């Protein structure tokens, strides 16, 4: 019931520019992790170097400059060095972090894409969702999208089921999670309702357990096999921004607009602990008064270790104890 900082990274023009981190993700083996955001670059870090080096030294091993602000990253689960990005122009790109080059650009979305996800079980497949109200499924072997879903509202988040590339969870601005069987997109297989605002994130704890976040200041747990609402989590403030959601088999973690990371155990509806970002030199670069928010989080897949980042560009590695 405590969070502890074991590493902190401030890299970039932190005090003179915008540095919101929109996405932070470990690669397939939890060896590297990457950040992306409004500063128009993808940074790749070596996790072991980060947690074992001295501070004021932390730097990425790779920095890839991009044309547009980035909204999301997803590492490929089979080609370890491949990573997908979505950006504010709608473009979905797959990069090689070793050569620092783009491998493929998918340019069908007409508006900002919020989310991308590489499938674990069919690893050539990539799904994206956008303000243009479309879900698009891409195959890295092909130039055009292979599936398109015309939806009624902005798509804020997309995620493949971890056990099957035939199912995706889709978080919509219409306040619902649309759970699609991609073999028949005529209608969603299930629609989960209960949130009072847009569904900003969807993440699977398992093949049948799905978590969601919403700007109604709740996280919610669902069973996508039994088509049931399971639990609602409250205690954090999230009425406006994308503040991050990450889950493992037992815990849900999210950001907040009070510059705080929260951790929930999946069976308890109040937070078990939290960590508060912020520092003297950012208090009066003024405005931890209300403006700073956590903006991305990601559990390590094999440890109670959490990557975290906020709207000022600070990255922390936390451990749960």
């Amino acid at each position: 019931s405590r969070l502890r900082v074991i590493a902190e990274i401030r890299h970039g023009d932190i005090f003179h520019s915008a540095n919101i981190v929109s996405s932070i993700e470990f690669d397939r083996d939890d060896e590297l992790f990457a950040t992306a955001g409004v500063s128009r670059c993808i940074k790749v870090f070596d996790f072991s170097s980060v947690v074992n080096e001295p501070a004021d030294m932390q730097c990425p091993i790779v920095e890839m400059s991009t044309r547009s602000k980035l909204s999301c990253l997803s590492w490929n689960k089979h080609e370890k060095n491949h990573i997908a990005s979505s950006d504010y122009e709608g473009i979905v790109t797959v990069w090689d972090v070793t050569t620092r080059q783009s491998l493929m650009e998918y340019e069908e979305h007409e508006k900002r894409a919020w989310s991308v996800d590489f499938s674990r079980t069919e690893p050539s497949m990539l799904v994206s969702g956008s303000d243009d109200c479309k879900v698009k499924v891409w195959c890295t072997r092909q130039e055009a999208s292979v599936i398109n879903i015309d939806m009624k509202a902005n798509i804020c988040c997309v995620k493949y089921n971890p056990g099957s590339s035939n199912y995706i969870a889709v978080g919509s601005a219409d306040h619902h999670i649309h759970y699609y069987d991609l073999r028949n997109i005529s209608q969603p297989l299930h629609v989960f309702s209960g949130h009072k605002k847009a569904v900003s994130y969807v993440k699977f704890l398992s093949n049948n357990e799905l978590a969601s976040a919403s700007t109604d200041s709740t996280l919610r747990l669902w069973d996508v096999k039994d088509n049931l609402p399971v639990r609602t989590f409250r205690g954090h403030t999230n009425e406006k921004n994308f503040v991050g959601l990450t889950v493992n088999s037992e815990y849900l973690a999210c950001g907040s607009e009070t510059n705080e990371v929260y951790v929930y155990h999946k069976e308890i509806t109040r937070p078990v602990t939290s960590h508060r970002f912020g520092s003297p030199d950012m208090d009066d670069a003024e405005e931890e008064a209300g403006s700073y928010f956590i903006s991305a989080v990601c559990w390590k897949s094999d440890s109670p270790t959490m990557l975290t980042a906020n709207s000022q560009g600070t990255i922390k590695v936390l451990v749960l104890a």
Binding site: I20, V38, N154, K197, A198, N241
Partner: peptide
């Protein structure tokens, strides 16, 4: 502003 969740 950036990273704001759309409303509908």
């Amino acid at each position: 502003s950036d990273q704001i969740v759309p409303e509908y």
